[PDB]
Amino acid sequence: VVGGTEAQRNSWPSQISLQYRSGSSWAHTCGGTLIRQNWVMTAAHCVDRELTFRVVVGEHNLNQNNGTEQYVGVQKIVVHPYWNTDDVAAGYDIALLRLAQSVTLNSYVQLGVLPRAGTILANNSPCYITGWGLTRTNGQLAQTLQQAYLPTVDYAICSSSSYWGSTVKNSMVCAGGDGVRSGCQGDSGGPLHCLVNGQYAVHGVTSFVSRLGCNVTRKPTVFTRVSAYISWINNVIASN
Numbered sequence: 010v011v012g013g014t015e016a017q018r019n020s021w022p023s024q025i026s027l028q029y030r031s032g033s034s035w036a037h038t039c040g041g042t043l044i045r046q047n048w049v050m051t052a053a054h055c056v057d058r059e060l061t062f063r064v065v066v067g068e069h070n071l072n073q074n075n076g077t078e079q080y081v082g083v084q085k086i087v088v089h090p091y092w093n094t095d096d097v098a099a100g101y102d103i104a105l106l107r108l109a110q111s112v113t114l115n116s117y118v119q120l121g122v123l124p125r126a127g128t129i130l131a132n133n134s135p136c137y138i139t140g141w142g143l144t145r146t147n148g149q150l151a152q153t154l155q156q157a158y159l160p161t162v163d164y165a166i167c168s169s170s171s172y173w174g175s176t177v178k179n180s181m182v183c184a185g186g187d188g189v190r191s192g193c194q195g196d197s198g199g200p201l202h203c204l205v206n207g208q209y210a211v212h213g214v215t216s217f218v219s220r221l222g223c224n225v226t227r228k229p230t231v232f233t234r235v236s237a238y239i240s241w242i243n244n245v246i247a248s249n
């Protein structure tokens with residue numbers, strides 16, 4: 010997250026770190042959201058590679074013991090059936106991961122609340138992106154969980170020529186684009202939390218930014234719109 014600030018350790022209890030085994034160690038690769046005690050939602054493009062993955066919940070500092078982490082293997086990966094790796098702009102950038110064991114809920118570990126199906130945010134709605142992604146274009150991952158305030162940009166605007174044009178679809182949400190704050194590598198799969206009727210819900214799964222850098226004016230971060238996929242999510246979980 011570029012232009013972010015350190016999150017309080019109990020602000021975003023549905024946030025997870027997806028990590029892969031790298032030699033003798035594990036390394037953070039993207040974010041995601043806990044949606045059942047044994048299911049995680051992330052971006053499809055995060056699990057494109059044939060790696061060994063684990064999920065870490067209750068994480069705050071990637072490089073120190075926080076005393077709150079639970080580590081759990083990924084048992085099954087279900088990517089959206091329409092997803093196509095060489096066409097992120099077509100959408101369907103979403104995947105569910107079944108965990109090997111169910112995690113225990115506490116003040117650091119909670120289920121993410123999803124929006125009702127079909128819900129669309131008005132232009133300029135207040136949202137926070139959270140994650141451990143790069144803190145500058147071509148930079149390094151954050152140690153501690155970061156958050157940034159990124160107001161939504163509605164489809165009519167973000168699909169106009171000076172923004173994303175037809176690369177953005179109605180199945181997506183855009184947020185940010187002020188040139189100071191944005192998502193960045195390592196944030197993919199992570200949540201966009203928006204305050205609706207007094208309650209934060211996860212409205213987006215971070216999907217892509219502009220190859221011209223993370224924080225670029227009029228290239229808001231693009232997220233998969235979770236409220237477009239409520240039935241898909243229910244169906245997968247009901248059938249697995």
Ligand code: NA
Binds near residue numbers: 070073
């Ligand atoms: Na830690």
